[model samples]
Target: SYMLPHLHNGWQVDQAILSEEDRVVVIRFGHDWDPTCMKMDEVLYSIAEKVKNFAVIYLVDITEVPDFNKMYELYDPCTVMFFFRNKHIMIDLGINWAMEDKQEMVDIIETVYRGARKGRGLVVSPKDYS
Candidate 1:
């Protein structure tokens, strides 16, 4: 099992977003034991080392943290979001849920990073999910 870092509280989560000034802060919000989350985690961990230069990944358990539930509208079993310099980067992923493909995920992050670096708050995904 690959071990990815988990943010345990609201402050740590906020700090992760704030501290990551250069790379995109990728956070996966979900339950650790859920099947969908497990699949997503595997994909995330696989790319963790490769994306270290442009992006960083963190896991947050909804039940454990619960701080951003209403704020972020985290209703899905697994939700992956991106943030750059404390600003949330919105991507138009039509499915709007857990994505299992590693390469596709990488492309999405790369596209978002490119746009975020240019001061864009919302960026289009490299590929259309719809």
Candidate 2:
């Protein structure tokens, strides 16, 4: 229901990363109907266009795809990840909503943008809920 592009299967997810010559590919992997995913999708939808220049956010339905379930350890209801140049970019934000504060969410997304653009495989996220 959100505006984010949905990757239906593992192949689509693979293509998404391969096609991105620039910008970070942020994939929201989960079940669309799940409450947690719905909440996260709202946040992602809000910032999708705002960060379109530096990043692209996508959605993946675990029930529909299930291909990356074991590969990416996607057992949770929702998991967000970043990829640049076909390589995973790890951001230490733990497993939760982007952030409770909207501004902090945007700041963290931008931080990911900065880190990905700098070609870093791992970027330390700001204070995340412990």
Candidate 3:
């Protein structure tokens, strides 16, 4: 129902996370039918084209791809995580809820990309969500 691409299985999710060499792999883990996930998807879709050169986005249903549910601690209705060069890039957004601001999301992704390029495993978000 959303325009963003979805990773159907664990293998596909693994490849999505591993295949990107330069760009940030942004994955939204949750059910598409969930309201929070829908809102998050809207934000992700809005920036997909704009962030295409520096980042890639994907959607994964926890129920459809339960392989990462326990490993990623994906208990939130919608959870977004970033990866680069086979490493998980951590961002301290200070919240477990969905981010609705397009610019804020873009800022976070850009900052993470810049830091990831610099070989940092974790990056501070541009804005203090806390």
Candidate 4:
């Protein structure tokens, strides 16, 4: 016999992941040496207040670590913030967390939970502008 696992936040330092929905995971990648990454650190932590459905993963050290870099390559900080759902980046878009529109994130989550973009907006995945 088997059982379903419950999703909850925990201190998991491992980098191996097949899917975010495999568990409630939220990954944030940045390096400890760079000031830009430091700023991003604070930004990620602050924006986390709006994320209630999943646990957060703060992956530090991008320059010195390959795992962090790889994870970030999957999700860009500029426009495509990947939200994995059922082994896929369900929600992806250009988000400027520092702007006033940040409050709309709540509604976005609601829409994601409902499955089809009810009112959350659009999910723009990894795009190449070249």
Candidate 5:
């Protein structure tokens, strides 16, 4: 299965979504002053430890790079994360985050990952089918 481009692990901000076997989850939006980012990063790293199949990227801030602005336009996420599989667009996560709910959010993301397992194949989302 496709992990990273070469199983490199850990994605950088706005890295082009590649045809990955496992979904690439990017956490976009970190505040320099927000200690919560550190806490959340730990949580994500912990998850990455457990789920080696999934990829996680941490976009360091609202101004780390020019790509940050691109992410902001895709999803004006304050504490948002994105999930991309099959070189497709990433789905935004963490739109509703609170410092107190860090662990819970991680758990929920795990659940979401379970469902996303089917993404190993070339699954594509269709629009306006109805």
Candidate 6:
């Protein structure tokens, strides 16, 4: 049960990315207590402060914001999307693991930060996921 900013509805999600002038908007779209979410949240919570300068992490429960479920193709238990300058930062975290390696997770965060700051609409992962 880690604590982090929670977006209760689609409007909040809109406001989050829209209002964030700089820094990548990192939204973890998932449900609470779901095994995947629990692990993912742990990783997010751990890196929240370290990446504060480059990203803003927010948690969204799909049940709460079903609007983006189909739009973002968020059919999985957990999915993360990045946004910067009111645009989606499309990086393929495209994964199948818990981020058990903290260093790897940190690297991913930095990749997003660097790419978003460069005004890139899409950023690829440093390593291939498939």
**Steric collisions counted per model:** 0, 0, 0, 1, 1, 0
Model 2 agreement with the true structure over 23-60: per-residue lDDT tens digits: 88888888788888888888888878888888888899
Q: What is the model-wide C-alpha lDDT for candidate 1? A: 0.84
lDDT by residue for model 5 (34-125), tens: 66655655555555545555655454555444344454563333465545563334333324234344455555555545556755323222
Whole-model Cα lDDT per candidate? 0.84, 0.78, 0.84, 0.39, 0.47, 0.78
Give the TM-scores of the predictions, in the order they appear. 0.89, 0.86, 0.89, 0.44, 0.52, 0.87
- Give the backbone clash total of model 1: 0
Native-referenced Cα lDDT, model 3:
0.84
- RMSD for each of the candidates: 2.3, 2.5, 2.3, 8.8, 8.1, 2.6
Q: What is the per-residue lDDT of model 1 for residues 16-117, given as tens digits with 9 covering 90 to 100?
A: 899988999999898889887888888888888888899999999998999999856767678888899999888874423556678877888788889999
How much is the lDDT of residue 84 in candidate 1? 97
Tens digits of lDDT, candidate 3, 1-130: 4557899999999998889999999999988799889888888889888888899999999988899887567776788888999898988644246676887778878888999999999887645434
* Model 5, residue 16: C-alpha shift (Å): 5.7
Candidate 6 lDDT, 9-90, residue by residue in tens: 9899999889888788888887776888888888888888888888888899888788788756775767677788888777
Please list all clashing residue pairs in model 1, or write none if there are none: none
Give me candidate 6's TM-score against the actual structure.
0.87
For candidate 6, give the lDDT of residue 83. Answer: 81
